[PDB]
A paper describes a structure:
We performed 3D variability analysis using the 3.8 Å-resolution consensus map of [name]/[name]/[name]/[name]. This analysis revealed several continuous movements within individual protomers of the [name]/ELMO1CTD/[name] core region. Next, to capture representative conformations of the [name]/ELMO1CTD/[name] core region, we divided the [name]/[name]/[name]/[name] consensus map into 10 classes by 3D classification. Five classes of sufficient quality were obtained with resolutions ranging from 4.2 to 4.5 Å and subjected to atomic model building and refinement. The resulting structures of classes 1 to 5 differed from one another in dimeric molecular dimensions. The distance between the two DHR-1 of [name] at the tip of the [name]/ELMO1CTD/[name] protomers, measured between the Cα atoms of Lys460 (one of the phosphatidylinositol (3,4,5)-trisphosphate binding residues), was shortest for class 1 and longest for class 5. Structural differences were due to the conformational changes between the armadillo repeat domain and DHR-2 in [name], accompanied by a shift in the PH domain of [name]. Of the five, class 5 of [name]/ELMO1CTD/[name] showed a flatter dimer than that of the others, similar to the DOCK2/[name]/[name] dimer. Collectively, these results suggest that DOCK2/[name] and [name]/[name] are intrinsically similar in structure and exhibit conformational flexibility. Consistent with this theory, our cryo-EM single particle analysis reveals that the [name]/ELMO1CTD/[name] core region is highly flexible and can, therefore, readily transition to a flatter conformation.
Author numbering:
A (entry chain E): 629 to 1262
B (entry chain D): 530 to 727
C (entry chain E): 1 to 248
Write the structure that this text describes.
């Protein structure tokens, strides 16, 4: 690891006494074995740096030192030499000795960029591009070495300008067509943020940011889309820990690219790339130390949400990373405040556009809760999704109450999507789901409480806020509310049977012209199907009857009618109770027909003709299981 | 481990209980049993299900069912336990004493079990192998409410006892149980609870 | 039986034996009854048992091997080594649910998975025992954290159970609702390990070369251990035996 077998390495280390050979040594350094190279990497670097200082005026030697150094760093980037890459940065921070290598190398690479179309500088600029991070670690370090060696940089303007004309070389090179230097543009985009943190040492963050902004608006806006996505992503990676001074200058341009990505029908390379964008930006903006951005978070909302929601109108397909995009904007929801939401979520354009937006968002939510986008193993992510969707829909609830409620003269029928969406979401993760493990109840309640509880009480206060238009909404929501009452939860159900009394009272006001007969009919129907399903229980019907009966006591004669109808309901219920218990107890024939003829008779009593027929069908099914052509005929 | 073994083997009740329960479930589920000398196109497969009521045996001259039990009131759906004297097992079986055409061979001695009911007609049965034979007679003894005579049953009982005592002893790790239980501290003879109950 | 006090410095209620029936709410108490004692008496302790977290039991302090430890062993630094003993409590609750798993695993004749469950169970109880203390290096601590999480969620995968993330340091930090996307890709990590295992049971428990290849993709330098036993050769003189690796 110390012995060297090459004339070239000894000559280049001894270039000072081999000064006639410096030009030839700078090219013979290529054939030196890397294994021998990292034996004296420090000395080779010092040799080259003292070269391009001692005849920095001879820019031929500076160019060859540039080329040789670039080739060495490319070689060291190898996995064999990735261990001496720490040794290389050790040299960068410690063993470097070139007081003007910042000027010289920024100069040479400004030449490389301004002369990139050259196919002899093309490879040279490329190999400089791959290690731009390393090279301007070296160069920013040479800049500060100049600072120290001269107290103040009388080159204080010179080098930062060399950077600025290198910005302009960027802009002019890439203003040219993409054909000559598509890969050069890609490498610029890639390794350009690799050096922005290098230059953060010695340049103004804002001037640097806007110099890049000029470069990026020298973009003809149809070239290497995910590549510039990478570029900005590595940019916000670094350089954003100082957020409040570039965040507000880049997010303009970056929401420009976003709204271009809103729907350009060319997102098919940029879908996952933009989701990644969202990811890292939500990180860094949500990174607490990186910088306060709450108002800029609201800027993001106002300039990116109708955008991305029409974009997920675009990406509404389940097969792609739709789930990852879901994660994106719901992370946004998490990282964000209702101070930001109701600011302009509640204050979009004309009420028609905003309600179209909420149509979009609500149908999307209902389509995600249905055909859920997890593996069922993501109860953790399930809960996360629950909370964030809760947040979003809560915001839309305030915008509904304050802009489309009794507030609005009409269009109280987003509430259909609201309520049914909320219920359909609510119809998973129940007490038995909590009952999987013994700690499972405890695990959820400690880590999450009972999300269902908040969901239900939210919807309940919404219902009470509806007021008159319960009647204008009851038959739509009769089905879902019975189910939510079904939920094995004691408290939401206890709060929900009074909601049954609420809408039967409303249709009691409607009973001046009609009655709750449609309400109770739909209620009975859905009751039939649901108790057939088998969620509820005995104490459950007890709670149902106690509540509704009592509430109707709190009310008039027609509430007494509704009382005896709820009595019929409870009769029905217990009939289904013992019915099903026999259905899943005896599993003989005769008892099944026993209970089914009983309940059939009960429909006959209630004339529930349709369902009466339905269980007549079940019963005849039993009889031709028994080939009771006799009974089946009857 | 002597106090530990005292503590362990003293709290038996539920282990043999659950093993016998499992045996009962085995009889209730049942399978296709074997008749006697099922040679001249005779059903070596036919089921004997212990009732869901655990009161009738669904044994009947059913066909060669490779799946196993077919659920119906079998050709002999009834076998009440109030009259089941015992089951003859091994050479004690009348079908093992047959010297006529139904002479059971020497490969069915462990497949020998005939339920004693009515004192004259024995459910002269043949098993497919030893273990389920021992399990059948185990579950039948469970209907009789007596010991289980499968070697594997005692295997299960001992291993469950060992695992259970293993899965209790965790907290007294780093502590010892004196063979004489540690002295019960003299409780305050007054039942007085200065702070309220619970 | 006076002087009862509500306190939380007792959570590890510890028995001695199949306890006496000294009180109406006491029995031949289970050995691993960490009882949450709601009432503090000098010689006795009554509170929520481990079997019943809703019922008291007056247990003698001569039998109570009281431990001030709460659920987390770092609040009073009950950790034998910081950032670990959450592992011991999670493993205890783990075996709690293992109880239900295996007690069902006999009901269904699935004895192969049930026996590999038993042998993983013996491995985990012994690893649990060695990490009762912090004797192993923190390298072994993190390694066994990884392995315990691996086997736990492996049982979960085999049984469609919950997913615990934050692979290291107690599997809580990420499931501590820190973010969304970090949590998102962490649950993605969870599914990645899901696929790793669910595809690798047949690769390691069954196959023997792919496991070696996967290991060797991570390690580059190797040493061929050669143990010369005895040399048989008819030389009649001093023999120099030059042993080296060869590539024909």
């Amino acid at each position: 690891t110390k012995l060297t077998q090459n004339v070239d390495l000894l000559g280049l280390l001894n270039w000072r006494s081999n000064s006639q050979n410096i030009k030839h040594n700078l090219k013979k350094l290529m054939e030196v074995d890397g294994g021998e190279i990292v034996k004296f990497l420090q000395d080779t670097l010092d040799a080259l740096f003292n070269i391009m200082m001692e005849m920095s005026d001879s820019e031929t030697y500076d160019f060859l030192v540039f080329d040789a150094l670039v080739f060495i760093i490319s070689l060291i980037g190898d996995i064999k030499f990735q261990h001496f890459n720490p040794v290389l940065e050790t040299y960068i921070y410690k063993h470097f000795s070139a007081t003007l290598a910042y000027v010289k190398l920024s100069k040479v690479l400004n030449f490389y960029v301004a002369n990139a179309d050259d196919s002899s500088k093309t490879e040279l600029l490329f190999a400089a591009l791959k290690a731009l991070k390393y090279l301007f670690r070296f160069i920013i370090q040479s800049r500060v070495l100049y600072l120290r060696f001269y107290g103040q940089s009388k080159d204080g303007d010179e080098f930062n300008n060399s950077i600025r004309q290198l910005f302009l070389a960027f802009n002019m090179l890439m203003d040219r067509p993409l054909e000559e230097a598509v890969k050069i543009k890609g490498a610029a985009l890639k390794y350009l943020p690799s050096i922005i943190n290098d230059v953060k040492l010695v340049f103004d963050p804002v001037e640097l940011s806007v110099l890049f902004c000029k470069f990026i608006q020298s973009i003809p806006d149809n070239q290497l889309v995910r590549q510039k996505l990478n570029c900005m992503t590595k940019i916000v990676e670094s350089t954003l820990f100082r957020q409040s001074e570039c965040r507000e200058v880049l997010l303009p341009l970056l929401t420009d690219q976003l709204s271009g990505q809103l729907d350009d029908n060319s997102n098919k390379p940029d879908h996952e790339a933009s989701s990644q964008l969202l990811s890292n930006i939500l990180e860094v903006l949500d990174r607490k130390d990186v910088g306060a951005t709450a108002v800029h978070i609201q800027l993001i909302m106002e300039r990116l949400l109708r955008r991305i929601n029409r974009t997920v109108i675009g990406m509404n397909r389940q097969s792609p990373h739709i789930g990852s995009f879901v994660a994106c904007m719901i992370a946004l929801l998490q990282q964000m405040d209702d101070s930001h939401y109701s600011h302009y979520i509640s204050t979009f354009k004309t009420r028609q556009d905003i309600i179209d937006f909420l149509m979009e968002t609500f149908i999307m939510f209902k389509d995600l809760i249905g055909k859920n986008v997890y593996a069922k193993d993501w109860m953790v992510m399930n809960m996360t999704q629950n909370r964030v969707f809760l947040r979003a829909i809560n915001q839309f609830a305030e915008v509904l109450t304050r802009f489309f409620m009794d507030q609005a003269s009409f269009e109280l029928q987003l509430w259909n999507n609201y309520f049914h969406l909320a219920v359909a979401f609510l119809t998973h993760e129940s007490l038995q789901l909590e009952t999987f493990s013994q700690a499972k109840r405890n695990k959820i309640v400690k880590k999450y409480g009972d999300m269902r509880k908040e969901i239900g009480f939210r919807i309940r206060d919404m219902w009470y806020n509806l007021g008159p238009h319960k009647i204008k909404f009851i038959p739509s929501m009769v089905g879902p509310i019975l189910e939510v009452t079904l939920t094995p939860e004691v408290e939401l159900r206890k709060a929900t049977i009074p909601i049954f009394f609420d809408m039967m009272q409303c249709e009691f006001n409607f009973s001046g012209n009609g009655n709750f007969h449609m309400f109770e009919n739909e209620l009975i129907t859905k009751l039939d199907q649901e108790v057939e399903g088998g969620r509820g229980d005995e104490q459950y019907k007890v709670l149902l009857e106690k509540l509704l009966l009592e509430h109707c006591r709190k009310h008039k004669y027609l509430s007494s009618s509704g009382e005896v109808f709820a009595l019929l309901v409870s009769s029905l219920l217990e009939n289904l109770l013992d019915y099903r218990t026999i259905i899943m107890q005896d599993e003989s024939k005769e008892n099944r027909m026993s209970c089914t003829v009983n309940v059939l008779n009960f429909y006959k009593e209630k004339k529930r003709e349709d369902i009466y027929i339905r269980y007549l069908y079940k019963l005849r099914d039993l009889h031709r299981d028994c080939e009771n052509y006799t009974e089946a005929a009857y | 481990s002597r106090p530990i073994l005292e503590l362990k083997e003293k709290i038996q009740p539920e282990i043999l209980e659950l093993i016998k329960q499992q045996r009962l479930n085995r009889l209730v589920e049942g399978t296709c049993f074997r008749k006697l000398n099922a040679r001249r196109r005779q059903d070596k497969f036919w089921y004997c299900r212990l009732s869901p009521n655990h009161k009738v045996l669904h044994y009947g001259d059913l066909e060669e069912s490779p799946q196993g039990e077919v659920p119906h009131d079998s050709l002999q759906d009834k076998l009440p336990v109030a009259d089941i004297k015992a089951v003859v097992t091994g050479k004690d079986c009348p079908h093992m004493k047959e010297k006529g055409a139904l002479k059971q061979n020497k490969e069915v001695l462990e497949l020998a079990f005939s339920i004693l009911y009515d004192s004259n007609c024995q459910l002269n049965f043949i098993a497919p192998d030893k273990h389920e034979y021992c399990i059948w007679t185990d579950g039948l003894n469970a209907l009789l409410g007596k010991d289980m005579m499968s070697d594997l049953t005692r295997n299960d009982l001992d291993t469950l006892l060992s695992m259970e005592i293993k899965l209790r002893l965790l907290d007294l790790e780093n502590i010892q149980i004196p063979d004489a239980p540690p002295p019960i501290p003299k409780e305050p003879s007054n039942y007085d609870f200065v702070y309220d109950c619970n | 039986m006076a002087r009862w006090i509500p306190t939380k410095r007792q959570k590890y209620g510890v028995a001695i034996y199949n306890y006496n029936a000294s009180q109406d709410v006491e029995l031949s108490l289970q050995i691993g009854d960490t009882v949450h004692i709601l009432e503090m008496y000098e010689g006795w302790y009554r509170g929520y048992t481990l079997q019943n977290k809703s019922k008291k039991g007056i247990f003698p302090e001569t039998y109570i091997h009281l431990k001030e430890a709460t659920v987390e062993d770092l609040g009073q630094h009950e950790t034998v080594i910081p950032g670990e003993l959450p592992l011991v409590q999670e493993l205890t609750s783990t075996l709690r649910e293992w109880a239900v798993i295996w007690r069902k695993l006999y009901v269904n004749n699935k004895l192969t998975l049930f026996r590999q469950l038993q042998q993983m169970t013996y491995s985990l109880i012994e690893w649990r025992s060695q990490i009762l203390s912090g004797t192993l290096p923190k390298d072994e601590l993190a390694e066994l954290k990884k392995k315990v999480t691996a086997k736990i969620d492996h049982g979960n995968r085999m049984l469609g159970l919950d997913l615990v993330v934050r692979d290291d340091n107690g599997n809580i930090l990420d499931p501590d609702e820190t973010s969304t996307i970090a949590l998102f890709k962490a649950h993605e990590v969870a599914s990645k390990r899901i696929e790793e295992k669910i595809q690798e049971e047949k690769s390691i428990l069954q196959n023997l070369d792919l496991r070696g290849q996967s290991i060797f993709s991570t390690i580059h330098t190797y040493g061929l251990y050669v143990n010369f036993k005895n040399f048989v050769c008819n030389i009649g003189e001093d023999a120099e035996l030059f042993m080296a690796l060869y590539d024909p």
